Design a protein around this motif. Structure first.
Motif, PDB file in Angstrom:
ATOM      1  N   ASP A 167     -17.002 -19.792  36.495  1.00 21.84           N
ATOM      2  CA  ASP A 167     -17.600 -20.782  35.614  1.00 21.84           C
ATOM      3  C   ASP A 167     -18.833 -21.300  36.339  1.00 21.84           C
ATOM      4  O   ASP A 167     -18.727 -21.802  37.467  1.00 21.84           O
ATOM      5  CB  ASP A 167     -16.651 -21.956  35.333  1.00 21.84           C
ATOM      6  N   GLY A 221     -17.501 -23.430  30.763  1.00 21.54           N
ATOM      7  CA  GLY A 221     -16.065 -23.229  30.711  1.00 21.54           C
ATOM      8  C   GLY A 221     -15.336 -24.533  30.938  1.00 21.54           C
ATOM      9  O   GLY A 221     -15.613 -25.550  30.286  1.00 21.54           O
ATOM     10  N   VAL A 222     -14.413 -24.529  31.898  1.00 23.58           N
ATOM     11  CA  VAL A 222     -13.679 -25.732  32.255  1.00 23.58           C
ATOM     12  C   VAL A 222     -14.222 -26.370  33.541  1.00 23.58           C
ATOM     13  O   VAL A 222     -13.555 -27.201  34.138  1.00 23.58           O
ATOM     14  CB  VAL A 222     -12.168 -25.468  32.348  1.00 23.58           C
ATOM     15  N   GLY A 254     -18.597 -19.174  29.355  1.00 17.92           N
ATOM     16  CA  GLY A 254     -17.973 -19.412  30.637  1.00 17.92           C
ATOM     17  C   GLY A 254     -17.246 -18.172  31.086  1.00 17.92           C
ATOM     18  O   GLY A 254     -17.375 -17.102  30.480  1.00 17.92           O
ATOM     19  N   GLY A 255     -16.469 -18.335  32.164  1.00 14.94           N
ATOM     20  CA  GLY A 255     -15.698 -17.220  32.685  1.00 14.94           C
ATOM     21  C   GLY A 255     -14.862 -16.556  31.618  1.00 14.94           C
ATOM     22  O   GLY A 255     -14.703 -15.327  31.612  1.00 14.94           O
ATOM     23  N   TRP A 256     -14.386 -17.343  30.654  1.00 17.77           N
ATOM     24  CA  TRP A 256     -13.525 -16.815  29.601  1.00 17.77           C
ATOM     25  C   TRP A 256     -14.152 -15.649  28.832  1.00 17.77           C
ATOM     26  O   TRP A 256     -13.415 -14.871  28.211  1.00 17.77           O
ATOM     27  CB  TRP A 256     -13.148 -17.936  28.625  1.00 17.77           C
TER      28      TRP A 256
HETATM   29 MG   LIG Z   1     -13.925 -20.256  31.677  1.00 16.67          MG
END
Ligand SMILES: [Mg+2]
Ligand SMILES: [Mg+2]
Length: 250
Positions: A36, A41-42, A14-16
Motif C-alpha cells: 500500500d 488501500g488500508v 492499493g495493494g488489493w
Molecule cells: Mg490494499
C-alpha cells in the motif's frame, strides 16, 4: 528462475488490486510483495498529509531500504505506479533487477520528471474523467483525484467482471498526481513495458507514445486487456512476468 516481485499499484488503488496476480506468481515459486502506498488501500494516512510524489512513495522506499544485501527485486508498476518506480529506482537502483511498466507512466531522463504526466494531461479532454471528483486541499494547494463509479466502470474496468468493478467501488480512495530522473540511477535499470490494448484510462496510443519516447528493453502486448489487466488478464500477465523473471537475473 525465481524472483522477488514488488508490485506497485496506481492512483486511488492499493495493494488489493494485485490480489489475483500475487497467488499466481507465488505458485510459480516467486516471492511477492504488494505494497500500500501512503493514503492508499488500508494505509492509515489520509491524502491531506501527503505533499509530494516522493512522500506518497514512502512505503516503497522504506521496503527497499530494508532489503538485505544481495537481495534484488523486479519492480512492477501500474498506471501512476510507474512514477513510483522512477522515484524508487533513483534511490535504490543497486537493488532493482528490472522494472516492469504495466500500462503505466514511464518517465524518462531527457525530459523533466513530470513530462509524461503533463503530456498525458494535455492529450486528455476533461470530459474523459466522467464522474471523477477533483478537489483542492492545503499542506504547509494540491489537487486531489477521486475516481467515481462511472469512470471506474467505463474507463478502467470495462472489460472486467462486475465483482472486479464492485470491489474497486468499495475500496478506491482519494489520490493525487501532486526534478529529473537520473541517467545513472533510473536510466540504468532494464525496463519492460506491458501494453494493454483495450485500455481506456491510458490509451494504447499514449502507451505506444511513451515507448517511442524512451524505448525499453522489452515490450509485451496484452490483447483484450483493459486498464486493470491484472484482474481480467491475470493468467497471461503472470506468464509475461515469468518470462521477465527468467530473463533478468544472474
Ligand atoms: Mg490494499
Ligand atoms: Mg464490469
Amino acid at each position: 528462475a525465481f524472483a522477488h516481485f514488488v508490485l506497485v499499484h496506481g492512483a486511488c488503488h492499493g495493494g488489493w488490486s494485485w490480489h489475483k496476480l500475487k497467488p499466481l506468481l507465488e505458485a510459480l515459486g516467486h516471492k511477492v510483495t504488494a505494497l500500500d502506498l501512503a493514503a492508499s488501500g488500508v494505509d492509515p494516512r489520509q491524502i491531506e498529509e501527503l505533499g509530494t510524489l516522493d512522500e506518497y512513495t514512502e512505503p516503497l522506499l522504506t521496503f527497499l531500504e530494508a532489503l538485505p544485501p544481495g537481495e534484488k527485486v523486479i519492480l512492477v508498476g501500474h498506471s501512476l505506479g510507474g512514477m513510483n518506480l522512477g522515484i524508487a529506482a533513483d534511490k535504490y537502483c543497486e537493488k532493482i533487477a528490472a522494472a516492469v511498466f504495466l500500462a503505466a507512466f514511464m518517465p524518462d531522463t531527457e525530459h523533466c520528471s513530470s513530462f509524461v504526466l503533463e503530456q498525458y494531461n494535455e492529450r486528455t479532454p476533461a470530459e474523459n474523467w466522467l464522474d471523477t471528483q477533483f478537489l483542492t486541499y492545503t499542506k504547509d494547494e494540491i489537487t486531489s483525484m477521486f475516481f467515481g463509479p462511472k469512470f471506474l466502470a467505463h474507463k478502467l474496468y470495462q472489460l472486467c467482471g462486475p465483482e472486479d468493478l464492485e470491489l474497486a467501488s468499495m475500496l478506491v480512495r482519494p489520490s493525487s498526481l501532486m526534478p529529473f530522473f537520473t541517467k545513472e540511477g533510473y536510466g540504468s535499470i532494464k525496463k519492460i513495458y506491458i501494453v494493454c490494448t483495450e485500455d481506456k484510462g491510458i490509451p494504447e496510443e499514449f502507451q505506444r507514445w511513451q515507448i517511442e519516447n524512451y524505448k525499453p528493453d522489452k515490450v509485451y502486448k496484452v490483447e483484450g486487456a483493459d486498464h486493470m489487466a491484472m484482474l481480467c488478464k491475470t493468467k497471461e500477465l503472470a506468464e509475461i512476468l515469468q518470462e521477465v523473471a527468467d530473463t533478468y537475473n544472474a
